Amino acid sequence: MVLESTMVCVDNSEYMRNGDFLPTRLQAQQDAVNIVCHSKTRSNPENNVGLITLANDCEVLTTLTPDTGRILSKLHTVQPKGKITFCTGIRVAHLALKHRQGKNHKMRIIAFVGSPVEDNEKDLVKLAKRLKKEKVNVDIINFGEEEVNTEKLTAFVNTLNGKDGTGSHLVTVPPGPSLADALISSPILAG
Amino acid sequence: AVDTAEQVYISSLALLKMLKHGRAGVPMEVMGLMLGEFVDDYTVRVIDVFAMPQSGTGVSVEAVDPVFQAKMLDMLKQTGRPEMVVGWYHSHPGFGCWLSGVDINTQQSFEALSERAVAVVVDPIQSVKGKVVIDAFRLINANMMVLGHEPRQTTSNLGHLNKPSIQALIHGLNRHYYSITINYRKNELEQKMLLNLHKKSWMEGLTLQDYSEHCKHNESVVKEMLELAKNYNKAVEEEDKMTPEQLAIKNVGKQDPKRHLEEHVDVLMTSNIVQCLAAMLDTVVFK
Amino acid sequence: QSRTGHTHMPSVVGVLVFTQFWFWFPLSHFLSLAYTPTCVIGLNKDLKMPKVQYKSNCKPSTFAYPAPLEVPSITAKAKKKEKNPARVMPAQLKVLTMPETCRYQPFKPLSIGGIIILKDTSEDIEELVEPVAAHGPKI
Ligand SMILES: [Zn+2]
Prior knowledge:
3 chains; A: six-stranded mixed sheet; globular; C: 1 helix; 2 strands; 8% helix; protease (chain B); hydrolase (chain B); JAMM/MPN+_dom (chain B); 26S proteasome non-ATPase regulatory subunit 1 (chain C)
């Protein structure tokens, strides 16, 4: 089947409980993690899935393991503190990819971004140059917005996305009362 | 049909793990597994050694859990321990280091994969703290009874293998059960780290703390040991007053096993602490 | 060492490797490299073998061979002939005395044992040439 590692980064800021969008969509994207981890489990049960947030003091909630029975429990007690942290959020997983058991598992990291990015374009091109340098599959998922959706993140992805053939895809969700599961499951990354 | 001269390399890892495992070597039967790498035919090196949980059955093939063994071995494979198992060890308290029928049966069953199958039995219960001499065991082929027992070359090290010369176990059960020599190895990092670590383990923190303690205890506590030392000195001189009579009568042969000389030399050595520490007080007072 | 006092390299190598049998016993086979037979050489020509017979100032029975069990005051001349010179002790090199009636005599006075040649003093017929052996255990 498919031998690859899955890393998800969820936001724990207070920007995920606003009443305009879904009713505390944290549970909705939790069900998204559930359907992508159970979908990858149905495709290849040997894939390991890690859990970590993007707070100031990043904490590894669950080590990379195919056993999601305790991951379902670890998805709770999100500790809604902090706002956003991007640099050590990338470096806390992309550098931790070397701690996986199976060396044949490809590198794939996703992230749920629910807060505006605090890093300037220089950090975007330095981190995009680092991720394109080490050649890690990066899927950017941006939930919620305050300013325009993609102004510098467009060039961030275009400069970050190498290997144009069957490479990485960008997930941009527009506002809407519909669920996010079917909207993020539309690309080829899910399934 | 070929045999060589093998020798088991023993580092301080397996040694200290067999010493902590010997401290945990309760009368109940215990289990352990040795790891390492096979580079050639006649050498074997052990690096990784861990313990196993005890069971009411004791040493047996049923107590060895293959999912637990393979689980811990896999957790060692995901870490920086890419070594395969090389043997299993245990403890035989009281009844001697020899191997019973169950031990030779689980050894026969565990030797199907590894042709060497190194077996070590540690027994620190009745062994004195002066020597920690340990011996490794081997299994001989039952079909070699017609030919020579052990066609092992380099018969020089057998003199070093003759140190366990108990007159009941080695040749009391030597039939179908022999042993192998053991050597050690120590690099410069273990030599300087463990050497300076032991010297520091016998030294002080700043190394200047407990010096003045004795330099100034020479005036308070050692004075009692000096007066008692003079009490033993006079307590021998009261007999040394009678010695020149016998020495003035017989002069032939010695009947008293006491020398009366080296003990007083040792008393002088304990008395020279005042002289050696007087310069220390001179340095502390000076600067 | 040699006769001139210099030491032989394959003798020292052979004896040290001979002492190296402790770690590896088959290494003792290099002892044959240190075997130095003690004898004399009176070979005059490369293809002609003469016969030199000297005499010793000691007793011949004292220099005989210690013949073991079966288990089923001066000699007239030495036993070295056709030169088959036998063993000779280094202390025996001072008691040898060449005969004055010997037909042949080298140019150098034979004082100590070693490798020397023979000088034809007569330079006449009857050099007493002896034949060579034949095929067998050797070539
Ligand atoms: Zn027992």
